[PDB]
Every structure is written in C-alpha cells, then in structure tokens.
C-alpha cells in the first residue's frame, strides 16, 4: 500500500474575488477537468475540480456579506465514471449544480439537484433559473462546504473531486481570540481507491453481480481503499507548539469516521455544523459521517517535537485496517512559532439554542426505509416515496417543527435539511421487528438526550439503527423549493432524498 505520511498537507488557497465592493462580492468558479498528482508515488490523478484544484478554492466571507459566485460547467461532455442509466428517467450526460451545504440561500442559489446545467450553461435542468447564484450569508459564522448536486450524479461528481470549503466569519466571534489565520486550517477528508496508473477506481457494480443487474449498476454503499485529507494520501503537517483551529469536514460518499491523536490527547471542540457551540467542549474522540463538521482546538503546545496521529476507528464495510484507514494524517510538532500564541480555548462561546422559545407548529413523523426494484437492488426511500412523487414535507415559513426520524433499518442515515440549522432533541431505541410487522412503534429504553456536541445547532445528524431521532427546525428565513435527504451519497442518488417546500401561506 501507499507510504503514509510522505507528503506535506495542502492548504486551499483562499479564492480571490474578480469583483469586489463595499456593496457586492463577486467570483466565478469553473469545473475543469485537470490531474493532480494525490501521493508522491503515484502518477498524476485526472480529477474534476473546482478552478481545477481539488479540494476547490477556499472561500473566505463575512456574516452579511453580499456574495455570488457565478458556478461554470467547463468539464468534458463524457463521464470518466461509470454512470449507471438506469436510476433516472435528450438530456446531456454530464450535468452539475454547485450546492452550498450549511448556506442561508435563497431556493433558486441552493443548487437544486434539477437545476443542474451542461458546459456552458447548453443545457438546463427543468427547475434552473440563473447561472449566478446569491448567497447573502445572513446567518451564523459557521463551517460551510460547497459541493456538486446533480440529480441521479451527485456521488459520482463528489467522487471525481467536486468538492470545497466555505467559511463565514462573524466579526462578533473575533473578541474570542480563537486560533486564526495561518492557524486555522480546514481539514476536508475524502476516501479514495486509487488505481496503480494513478486513476480514480470507482465501482461499475457491486462484487460478483448477479446476473440481473445493469452494467454500470449503482452500488448501496463505496468504501475507499485509501484516505486522502486536503487531496493528499495520508499527509503530514508541520505545526507550531501552540494552539490550532482546525475546520474539520468530511467530503466523503459513505465513510464514517471516528477520530482521535494517538498519544491519547484532547480536541476541545468549539463549534458543529450550524456554528459555535454554547460552550467548549473537551473530546477523547468523536464521530463524522459524511457531510458533518466539528470545529476544534488542537493544543500543541506540551507536545514539541512529537508525531501525533490522527487516528480514526470506524469501519467501513468491515473492520478498520490499522496500515490503511485507521490513519487519517499526521501532526509534526516541528514549527518554529511565529509569534507569540495569543490564541485562547474559551469556554464561553454562544448563545444557547434553548434559550428561544418558539411554539410548536407541526410534528412530522418519517421514516427511514426503502424497497427492491426490478433488477433486485435495494432502492432506499424516506416515507417510501420517490424523489418524483408528489412533494409532502411542507412546512410553513417562519414556524418550528419537531421532525422524528424513525430508522428500522439496519445502518445509521446521516439526515440533512437544506437551508436551516436544528436543534437535536433526543434519541430513542424501539423494537424493530414489532414496527415492520405492525407499524406500530414500542420504545425499548428511555430518550436520551444529546450529548454536549449536539447541544448546538445541527444541519446533519446520524439517525442511528433501530432508534427514533428528534429534532426541531424554524423553517425559514425563506420560502421555496428545497430538499431533505441521507447524505451518504450512494443512497442519495437512489432514492433516498425528497423535496421540502416551505410555504409562504
Ligand atoms: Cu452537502
Ligand atoms: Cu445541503
Ligand atoms: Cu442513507
Ligand atoms: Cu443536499
């Protein structure tokens, strides 16, 4: 296998603007096809990259600020993974739609999956309305990431390398003093197979496929033989003995990971998906399922000299290999500082979400299953609907709704709600064989609430095996067509995603 820890980490460059005033921020991003090469003894990777870097360009924005990117399609006409025909039903074969995860955005600028274009905006999707999308980032300074949405390709154009960060910066968070600059750093992680020529390998089908099956034929699930972080194989960073903000994101299709250093020191992590958490919380260990984010402190300081692993112990598709996946990156404690650490890990950060107080409106029960097709692949469905059907889940905008997720299935669901952020209200176990018989749900053990990590606000959260998940969302600020959807990407494509329409009644 590859030699890990062979190559320096990559840090994005942050994306200048190609207009900029006091009134309006301006920048164009174009998907091109480029290669790269992913480990010192590999050859170079053809990939498909934002600007043709992957991971994108960092973009870096204020809270409030009145941002558009333009997002153009320069990409080949021909797939370079195989694209399965026959899970959506003449219409070009590459399509893409730039989605900005976490972003406050009005419903036209979120990147609907058919909203999507070919190169140069040839063709279009039935719900495309602007090739320049607005995001007025009025929302809390976060962790966001952009990535592509195409409908019946989203795994496939993530795979290929479609993916980058965006961070919204709230000038009220700067009194904090959390590490900064050169000293907060986002980490995305994407797994990987990597064939000797240096290719990207992604499956053409599941393992010994019956006979029945098309070729390509989708597959439930994609575990990568190899883990990448900035777009590098098991890198090293070169760190300074002090404190670093680390924007930790999860860019993979299905991979969960569970991290943690192995010399056995702490995270504190300060923020989630939606934000900074009310209050600093010190981890030995935490898990991130595709499409989450965990804002952490790493404190170097006590550790100068040392290799520090970044460890992770969450399988997939089997147990972790310690050579392999079991390795994320490694931290050098070798840096001489710059300057002074004046960098602080406080405990007070935010806010609570429970000190808002809203009423009520609906509580919308859903469940998490699916059915077989005609070939005999699982199809996964929430409420054992199509994406196509008619639209159900429509709350009304501006009132708060207590969403549980019911999951029978045998897998955790990484459930995601565009355009807001939610609170987690508890978890509860039930008796799974008694609700497919009978549909009748029969707790097994208490509510368990959230543990400090999911005290903030939410846009992502694991619906784990044989439990009821509560949350609660303020649908709004604006009203219009959006989705909802497991973001594990092979079961987002077939067909595990709805629309979600908030009305303006
Ligand atoms: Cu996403
Ligand atoms: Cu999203
Ligand atoms: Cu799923
Ligand atoms: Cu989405």
Redesign the pocket.
């Known amino acids: 296998t590859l030699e890990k820890f062979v190559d320096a980490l990559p840090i994005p460059d942050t994306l200048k603007p190609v207009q900029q005033s006091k009134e309006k921020t301006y920048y164009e991003v174009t998907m091109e096809e480029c290669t790269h090469q992913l480990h010192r003894d590999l050859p170079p990777t053809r990939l498909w990259g934002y600007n043709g870097l992957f991971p994108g360009p960092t973009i870096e924005v204020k809270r409030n600020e009145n941002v558009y990117v333009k997002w153009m399609n320069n990409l080949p006409s021909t797939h370079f993974l195989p694209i399965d025909h026959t899970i959506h039903h003449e219409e070009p074969e590459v399509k893409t739609v730039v989605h900005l995860h976490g972003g406050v955005t009005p419903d036209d600028s979120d990147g609907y999956p058919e909203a999507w274009f070919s190169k140069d905006f040839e063709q279009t999707g039935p719900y495309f309305k602007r090739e320049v999308y607005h995001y007025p980032n009025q929302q809390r300074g976060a962790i966001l990431w952009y990535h592509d949405h195409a409908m019946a390709l989203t795994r496939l154009n993530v795979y290929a390398g479609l993916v980058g960060a965006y961070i919204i910066h709230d000038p009220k968070e700067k009194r904090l003093k959390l590490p900064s600059d050169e000293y907060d750093v986002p980490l995305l992680i994407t797994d990987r197979t990597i064939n000797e020529d240096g290719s990207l390998f992604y499956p053409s089908a599941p393992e010994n496929p019956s006979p029945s099956l098309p070729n390509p034929s989708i597959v439930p699930a994609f575990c990568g033989e190899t883990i990448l972080v900035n777009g590098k194989v098991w890198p090293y960073l070169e760190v300074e003995p002090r404190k670093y903000r680390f924007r930790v994101i999860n860019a993979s299709n299905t991979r969960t990971y569970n991290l943690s250093l192995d010399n056995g020191g702490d995270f504190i992590q300060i923020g989630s998906d939606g934000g900074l958490l009310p209050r600093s919380v010190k981890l030995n260990s935490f898990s991130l399922a595709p499409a989450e984010r965990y804002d952490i402190i790493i404190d170097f300081t006590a550790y100068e000299g040392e290799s520090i692993i970044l460890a992770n112990s969450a399988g997939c598709g089997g147990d972790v290999n310690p050579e392999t996946d079991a390795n994320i990156m490694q931290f050098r404690v070798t840096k001489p500082l710059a300057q002074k650490d004046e960098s602080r890990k406080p405990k007070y950060l935010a806010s609570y979400p429970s000190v808002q107080h809203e009423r009520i409106q609906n509580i919308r029960t859903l469940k998490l299953a699916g059915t077989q097709d005609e070939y005999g692949r699982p199809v ?1 469905l929430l409420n054992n609907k199509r994406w196509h059907d008619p639209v159900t889940e429509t709350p009304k905008v501006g009132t708060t709704e207590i969403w549980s997720i019911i999951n029978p299935t045998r897998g955790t ?1 990484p459930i995601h709600l565009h355009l807001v952020s939610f609170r987690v209200l508890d978890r509860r176990p039930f008796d799974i064989a008694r609700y497919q018989e009978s549909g009748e749900l029969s707790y097994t053990g208490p509510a368990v609430p959230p543990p400090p990590s999911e005290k903030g606000w939410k846009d992502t959260i694991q619906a784990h095996a044989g439990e009821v998940l509560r949350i609660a969302a303020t649908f709004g600020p604006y009203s219009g067509r959006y989705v909802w959807h ?1 973001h ?1 990407l092979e ?1 987002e494509d077939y067909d ?1 995603m709805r629309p979600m329409d908030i009305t303006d009644p």
């Open positions: 996964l669901h497991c594990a079961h595990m």
